[PDB]
Symmetry: C2
Subunit: 170 residues, 2 copies
């Protein structure tokens, strides 16, 4: 298997395009309450799904909920795309502020894998150009992750590697 080591108290940041399988991964490895997703926070602001305007407020709520969990010393997983540096920086700063280890888990899958899963989703789907952009941004992000402030950086390079992950909470 592929053992990923994380401290008992950490902020685990999922990084991947839409369709890369982040939420599936989160549900398999973590308890429901450990996981905080952007879609969930969007749902706190709106019953609808297509309202492009609640996004900023939703991310504010995401950051605040994450902040209070870490304050209480509770391991937290951020289920969002996180392919942009601007999305990643505040998570890192929150983690440092509460003396937690920020951990990056990167879903370095080929674009066609994401595009394929997207077309078969039963919950919601995105436009093709969105996944293409996410993937390009994801790839651009990899090299600078350690320097951004992530203490552990784990790159998953194929669905097989993703499948074989086991977490080891020292």
């Amino acid at each position: 298997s592929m053992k990923l080591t994380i401290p008992e108290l950490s902020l685990v940041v999922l990084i991947g395009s839409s369709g890369s399988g982040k939420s599936t991964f989160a549900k398999k490895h973590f308890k429901p309450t450990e996981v905080i997703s952007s879609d969930f926070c969007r749902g706190l602001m709106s019953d609808d799904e297509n309202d492009q305007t609640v996004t900023g407020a939703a991310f504010d709520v995401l950051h605040y909920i994450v902040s209070k969990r870490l304050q209480l010393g509770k391991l937290t997983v951020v289920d969002a795309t996180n392919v942009q540096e601007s999305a990643r920086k505040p998570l890192i700063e929150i983690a440092k502020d509460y003396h937690c280890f920020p951990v990056a888990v990167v879903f370095n899958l080929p674009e066609k894998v994401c595009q394929e899963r997207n077309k078969n989703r039963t919950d919601r789907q995105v436009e093709e150009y969105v996944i293409r952009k996410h993937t390009q941004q994801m790839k651009k992000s990899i090299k600078g992750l350690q320097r951004e402030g992530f203490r552990y950086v784990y790159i998953l390079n194929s669905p097989e590697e993703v499948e074989e992950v086991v977490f080891e909470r020292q």
Copy 2:
């Protein structure tokens, strides 16, 4: 700074071309006895320095010394190029056998940086084609490090990042 976390008991494997600054790094961060270099083991087999005719035997000696240290539960740093998978696999297997974390520290520096430092070395120098080959092999190695068995993988992308490294050992 750039904090690199390592368990109290680990095998730290330095990965980089000649001239990338591994031994400098080792001396700055670790105690002399924690560090085992290929040059040193070559020196056990031959007075002729950087002697190439004793290379295999020297690596056998390096593997054996590393093995006994981990057996005694002593953190060990392997100061060698380590840019080939064949050089890295046995280190990983030794670490596993003694229930130790293998940790990879990669000196992902541009070739020209290594070539430049090489020309100014006062101890020993290598041919330019050697550093070019090392660098290409180093770059090819990076992606598969985790899958090879390294528990923590640290990539240093510039001399600045290398400079700013501080190790954090928690037992």
